[PDB]
């Protein structure tokens, strides 16, 4: 078995290897990459997502989210308070302000320490889930706006034609902006490209050990657990590396820098934070190996997790028994 310790692997494809996305994902899995839940892909040096980022300031963040924390430093939840719209230029200025900017630090480890120590005492503002792309249409390789669609994958593998579309989303981050512990909708893959700015630190649990994280989360967030049998789908709970170590949960961590891709694999729980002003783009995708994960994916039926139009069809076709109750949650 390749990669038996489930380490995060880092890949450096050549420009030739960067042509066929599906084939490279399948290559990575042949080397065991999926066992970690997360992989880093450094693009060939010849490749670029677009020519410059000089003209992005007028993108609108229609609903910036203020991430308010509750709990203790290593075990907290966050709630997203909606704020008034602002441009990316306005947001970058805010991110760079004295109130929100990254503190002085020695290296990524010292900044990680400061994040876990101090995150709860601040409420950074996140521009998340903004439909759109920053890839130039002329970028032909690993262009997250030109991937094959999950609906087309399901059709190719299973023969069923379904409605729905699959488009990317932009994320504008600042210091301390946080992504809570989650897997993807329907335990899909994700791919995330850090277009610009400061790094993003990731933590991940190997898929084969995801239930260990779930069991800890039910112990640590006991009222949330009683309220919903898949409450990590709410994307609000954080647990620090120190806490994970204290409870024997297997995990790994890695820092993504501008110009790098990360891939999350089916049922790879992940969480993380941004080091400073940055912009990422991400999208879900599928492969043949995903299908069985999609069939087994948990679902939130309490009604909090409230998810896309396109997830309907996935549930309907892959989880017909759940369909009924899950759609009661979504209506
Ligand atoms: O970058 C973020 O805030 C969150 N991204 C992801 O969870 C991802 O790409 O799967
Ligand atoms: Mg603009
Ligand atoms: Ni994710
Ligand atoms: Zn729920």
Coordinates of C-alpha atoms and ligand atoms in Angstrom, one line a residue:
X1 CA 0.0 0.0 0.0
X2 CA 1.4 3.4 -1.0
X3 CA 1.8 6.1 1.6
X4 CA 0.7 4.0 4.6
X5 CA 1.4 6.7 7.2
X6 CA -1.0 9.0 5.3
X7 CA 1.5 11.9 4.9
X8 CA 0.6 14.9 2.8
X9 CA 2.4 14.6 -0.5
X10 CA 3.8 17.4 -2.6
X11 CA 3.8 17.1 -6.4
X12 CA 5.9 18.9 -9.0
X13 CA 4.3 18.1 -12.4
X14 CA 6.1 19.0 -15.6
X15 CA 4.3 21.2 -18.2
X16 CA 3.7 17.9 -20.1
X17 CA 2.2 16.2 -17.1
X18 CA 0.0 19.3 -16.5
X19 CA -2.0 18.8 -19.6
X20 CA -4.3 16.0 -18.6
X21 CA -5.9 16.9 -15.2
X22 CA -7.8 13.6 -14.7
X23 CA -4.7 11.5 -15.5
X24 CA -2.6 13.5 -13.0
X25 CA -5.1 13.1 -10.2
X26 CA -5.1 9.4 -10.9
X27 CA -1.3 9.4 -10.9
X28 CA -1.3 11.1 -7.5
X29 CA -3.6 8.5 -6.1
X30 CA -1.4 5.7 -7.6
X31 CA 1.3 7.1 -5.3
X32 CA -1.0 7.1 -2.3
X33 CA -1.7 10.8 -2.1
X34 CA -5.4 10.4 -1.2
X35 CA -4.5 8.6 2.0
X36 CA -3.6 11.9 3.6
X37 CA -6.8 13.7 2.7
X38 CA -4.9 16.6 1.2
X39 CA -2.1 17.0 -1.5
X40 CA -0.1 20.0 -2.7
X41 CA 0.6 20.5 -6.4
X42 CA 3.2 23.0 -7.4
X43 CA 2.6 24.0 -11.0
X44 CA 5.3 23.9 -13.6
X45 CA 7.4 27.1 -13.7
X46 CA 6.2 27.9 -17.2
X47 CA 2.5 28.0 -16.1
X48 CA 0.5 31.0 -15.0
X49 CA -3.1 31.4 -14.0
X50 CA -3.3 34.8 -15.5
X51 CA -0.9 37.7 -16.5
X52 CA -1.4 40.0 -13.6
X53 CA -3.7 40.7 -10.6
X54 CA -3.5 44.4 -11.0
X55 CA -7.2 44.9 -12.0
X56 CA -9.1 42.9 -9.3
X57 CA -10.1 45.6 -6.9
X58 CA -13.5 46.2 -8.3
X59 CA -14.8 42.7 -7.7
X60 CA -17.6 43.0 -5.2
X61 CA -17.9 41.1 -1.9
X62 CA -21.6 41.4 -1.6
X63 CA -21.9 39.7 1.8
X64 CA -18.6 39.8 3.8
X65 CA -18.7 37.6 6.9
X66 CA -17.5 38.6 10.3
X67 CA -16.4 35.4 12.0
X68 CA -17.3 35.6 15.6
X69 CA -15.8 32.9 17.9
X70 CA -17.2 31.3 21.1
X71 CA -15.6 28.8 23.4
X72 CA -12.0 28.3 24.4
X73 CA -8.8 28.8 22.4
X74 CA -8.5 25.2 21.2
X75 CA -12.2 24.3 21.0
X76 CA -14.5 26.9 19.6
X77 CA -17.3 27.6 17.2
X78 CA -17.7 30.5 14.8
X79 CA -20.7 32.3 13.6
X80 CA -20.9 34.4 10.5
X81 CA -22.3 37.8 10.9
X82 CA -23.3 39.4 7.6
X83 CA -21.7 42.8 6.9
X84 CA -22.3 45.5 4.3
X85 CA -20.9 45.0 0.8
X86 CA -17.5 46.1 -0.1
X87 CA -15.1 45.9 -3.1
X88 CA -12.0 43.8 -3.0
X89 CA -10.0 47.1 -2.9
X90 CA -11.9 48.1 0.2
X91 CA -11.5 44.7 1.7
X92 CA -7.7 44.7 1.1
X93 CA -7.4 48.0 2.8
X94 CA -9.4 46.7 5.7
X95 CA -7.3 43.6 5.9
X96 CA -4.1 45.8 6.0
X97 CA -5.5 48.1 8.7
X98 CA -3.9 48.1 12.2
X99 CA -7.0 46.4 13.7
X100 CA -6.9 43.4 11.3
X101 CA -3.3 43.0 9.9
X102 CA -1.0 40.1 10.6
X103 CA 1.2 40.7 13.6
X104 CA 4.9 40.6 13.6
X105 CA 6.2 37.1 13.7
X106 CA 9.4 35.0 13.2
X107 CA 8.2 32.3 10.8
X108 CA 5.1 30.3 9.9
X109 CA 5.3 28.2 13.2
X110 CA 5.3 31.3 15.4
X111 CA 2.3 32.7 13.4
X112 CA 0.5 29.3 13.9
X113 CA 1.2 29.6 17.6
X114 CA -0.2 33.2 17.7
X115 CA -3.3 32.0 15.7
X116 CA -4.2 29.3 18.2
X117 CA -3.5 31.4 21.2
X118 CA -5.4 34.5 20.1
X119 CA -7.9 33.7 17.3
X120 CA -10.9 33.7 19.6
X121 CA -10.3 37.2 20.8
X122 CA -10.8 38.7 17.3
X123 CA -13.5 38.7 14.6
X124 CA -11.9 38.8 11.2
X125 CA -14.0 39.4 8.1
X126 CA -14.0 36.7 5.3
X127 CA -15.2 37.2 1.7
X128 CA -16.3 33.7 1.0
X129 CA -18.1 31.7 -1.5
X130 CA -18.2 34.3 -4.2
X131 CA -19.2 32.8 -7.6
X132 CA -16.5 33.6 -10.1
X133 CA -13.0 32.9 -11.5
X134 CA -9.7 34.7 -11.8
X135 CA -8.2 32.2 -14.3
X136 CA -7.6 33.7 -17.7
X137 CA -9.7 32.1 -20.3
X138 CA -6.5 31.4 -22.3
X139 CA -5.1 29.3 -19.5
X140 CA -5.7 25.8 -20.7
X141 CA -4.1 23.7 -17.9
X142 CA -5.6 23.4 -14.5
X143 CA -8.1 26.2 -15.1
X144 CA -10.7 25.7 -12.4
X145 CA -13.3 27.4 -14.5
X146 CA -12.8 24.7 -17.3
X147 CA -12.8 21.5 -15.5
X148 CA -15.2 18.6 -16.5
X149 CA -18.3 18.8 -14.4
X150 CA -19.4 16.5 -11.6
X151 CA -22.7 16.0 -13.5
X152 CA -20.8 14.8 -16.5
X153 CA -18.7 12.5 -14.3
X154 CA -21.8 10.9 -12.8
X155 CA -23.2 10.6 -16.3
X156 CA -20.1 9.0 -17.7
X157 CA -19.8 6.5 -14.7
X158 CA -23.4 5.7 -14.0
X159 CA -25.3 6.7 -17.2
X160 CA -27.8 9.0 -15.5
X161 CA -28.2 12.5 -16.8
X162 CA -29.0 15.1 -14.2
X163 CA -29.6 18.8 -13.9
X164 CA -27.1 21.1 -12.2
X165 CA -24.0 23.0 -12.8
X166 CA -20.5 23.2 -11.2
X167 CA -18.7 26.5 -11.0
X168 CA -15.8 27.9 -9.0
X169 CA -15.8 30.2 -6.0
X170 CA -13.5 33.0 -4.9
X171 CA -12.4 33.5 -1.3
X172 CA -10.8 36.8 -0.1
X173 CA -9.1 36.3 3.3
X174 CA -7.3 38.2 5.9
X175 CA -5.4 37.4 9.1
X176 CA -7.2 34.9 11.3
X177 CA -10.0 34.1 8.7
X178 CA -10.9 30.6 9.4
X179 CA -12.3 27.5 7.7
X180 CA -13.9 25.1 10.1
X181 CA -13.6 21.4 10.2
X182 CA -15.5 19.8 7.3
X183 CA -15.5 17.5 4.3
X184 CA -16.9 18.6 1.0
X185 CA -20.6 18.4 0.0
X186 CA -21.3 14.8 -0.8
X187 CA -17.7 14.0 0.2
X188 CA -16.5 15.4 -3.1
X189 CA -12.9 16.4 -3.9
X190 CA -12.0 20.0 -3.8
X191 CA -9.2 21.9 -5.6
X192 CA -8.0 25.2 -4.3
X193 CA -5.7 27.6 -6.0
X194 CA -4.1 30.4 -4.0
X195 CA -4.0 33.2 -6.6
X196 CA -2.3 35.9 -4.5
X197 CA -1.2 37.2 -1.2
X198 CA -0.4 35.6 2.1
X199 CA -0.4 31.9 2.9
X200 CA -3.1 29.6 4.1
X201 CA -2.4 26.9 6.7
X202 CA -4.3 23.6 6.4
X203 CA -4.9 20.8 8.8
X204 CA -6.3 17.5 7.6
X205 CA -7.5 14.0 8.9
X206 CA -6.8 11.0 6.7
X207 CA -10.1 9.7 5.2
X208 CA -9.6 6.3 6.8
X209 CA -9.7 8.0 10.2
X210 CA -12.5 10.5 9.7
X211 CA -14.8 8.8 12.1
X212 CA -12.3 9.4 14.9
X213 CA -12.5 13.1 14.3
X214 CA -16.4 12.8 14.2
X215 CA -16.4 11.0 17.6
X216 CA -14.2 13.7 19.2
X217 CA -16.4 16.4 17.7
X218 CA -19.5 14.8 19.2
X219 CA -17.7 14.8 22.7
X220 CA -16.5 18.4 22.3
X221 CA -19.7 19.9 20.9
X222 CA -22.3 17.8 22.6
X223 CA -25.4 20.0 22.2
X224 CA -24.6 20.4 18.5
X225 CA -24.3 16.6 18.2
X226 CA -27.7 16.1 19.7
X227 CA -29.2 18.7 17.3
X228 CA -27.9 17.1 14.2
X229 CA -26.4 13.8 13.2
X230 CA -24.0 15.5 10.8
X231 CA -23.3 18.8 12.4
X232 CA -19.8 19.3 11.0
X233 CA -21.8 20.0 7.7
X234 CA -22.6 23.3 9.4
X235 CA -19.0 24.3 9.0
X236 CA -18.7 26.1 12.3
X237 CA -16.5 24.0 14.6
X238 CA -12.8 24.3 15.3
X239 CA -10.5 22.1 17.2
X240 CA -6.7 22.9 17.6
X241 CA -3.8 20.7 16.8
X242 CA -3.0 20.6 20.5
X243 CA -6.4 19.3 21.2
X244 CA -6.3 16.8 18.4
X245 CA -2.9 15.5 19.7
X246 CA -4.3 15.3 23.3
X247 CA -7.1 13.0 22.0
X248 CA -5.0 10.9 19.7
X249 CA -6.6 12.0 16.4
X250 CA -4.4 11.4 13.4
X251 CA -3.8 14.6 11.4
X252 CA -1.3 16.5 9.3
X253 CA -0.6 20.1 8.5
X254 CA 0.8 22.1 5.7
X255 CA 1.1 25.7 4.5
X256 CA 0.0 26.7 1.0
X257 CA 1.6 29.7 -0.6
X258 CA 0.6 31.9 -3.5
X259 CA 0.9 30.0 -6.8
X260 CA 0.2 26.6 -5.4
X261 CA -2.8 24.2 -5.7
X262 CA -4.2 22.0 -2.9
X263 CA -6.4 19.0 -3.6
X264 CA -8.7 17.6 -0.8
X265 CA -9.8 14.0 -1.3
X266 CA -13.2 12.4 -0.6
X267 CA -14.0 12.3 3.1
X268 CA -10.7 14.2 4.1
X269 CA -11.7 16.5 6.9
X270 CA -9.9 19.8 6.7
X271 CA -9.7 23.1 8.5
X272 CA -7.4 26.1 8.4
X273 CA -6.6 29.8 8.5
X274 CA -5.3 32.6 6.4
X275 CA -2.0 34.4 7.4
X276 CA -3.0 37.8 5.9
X277 CA -4.7 39.3 2.8
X278 CA -5.1 36.7 0.1
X279 CA -7.4 35.4 -2.7
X280 CA -8.1 31.8 -3.3
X281 CA -10.3 30.0 -5.9
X282 CA -11.8 26.6 -5.4
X283 CA -14.2 24.2 -6.9
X284 CA -15.5 20.7 -6.2
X285 CA -14.8 17.8 -8.6
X286 CA -15.3 14.1 -8.9
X287 CA -13.5 11.0 -10.2
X288 CA -14.7 7.4 -10.6
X289 CA -13.3 6.6 -7.1
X290 CA -15.6 9.3 -5.6
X291 CA -18.8 7.6 -6.5
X292 CA -18.8 5.2 -3.5
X293 CA -18.0 8.1 -1.1
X294 CA -20.9 10.0 -2.5
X295 CA -23.2 7.2 -1.8
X296 CA -22.1 7.0 1.8
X297 CA -21.8 10.7 2.6
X298 CA -23.5 11.9 5.7
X299 CA -26.1 14.5 5.4
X300 CA -27.4 17.4 7.5
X301 CA -31.3 17.1 7.7
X302 CA -31.7 19.6 10.7
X303 CA -31.8 22.3 8.1
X304 CA -28.8 24.4 9.1
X305 CA -26.4 23.3 6.3
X306 CA -28.5 24.6 3.4
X307 CA -26.7 23.7 0.2
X308 CA -26.7 24.2 -3.5
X309 CA -29.3 23.5 -6.2
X310 CA -26.9 20.9 -7.7
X311 CA -26.5 18.9 -4.5
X312 CA -30.2 17.9 -4.9
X313 CA -29.6 15.7 -7.8
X314 CA -26.6 14.0 -6.2
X315 CA -28.7 13.1 -3.2
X316 CA -31.6 12.0 -5.3
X317 CA -29.6 9.7 -7.5
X318 CA -26.9 8.4 -5.0
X319 CA -29.0 8.5 -1.8
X320 CA -32.6 7.9 -2.8
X321 CA -33.6 6.6 0.6
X322 CA -32.3 9.8 2.3
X323 CA -33.8 12.0 -0.4
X324 CA -37.3 12.7 1.2
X325 CA -35.8 13.6 4.7
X326 CA -32.8 15.6 3.3
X327 CA -35.1 17.7 1.1
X328 CA -37.4 18.4 4.2
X329 CA -34.2 19.9 5.6
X330 CA -33.6 21.9 2.4
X331 CA -37.2 23.3 2.2
Ligands
LIG1 O1 -10.0 28.4 1.4 C1 -11.0 28.3 2.2 O2 -11.5 29.2 3.0 C2 -11.8 27.0 2.3 N1 -11.4 26.1 1.2 C3 -11.8 24.8 1.3 O3 -12.3 24.2 2.2 C4 -11.5 23.9 0.1 O4 -10.9 24.4 -0.9 O5 -12.0 22.8 0.2
LIG2 MG1 -11.9 44.6 -10.8
LIG3 NI1 -13.2 22.4 1.8
LIG4 ZN1 -27.6 20.0 10.7

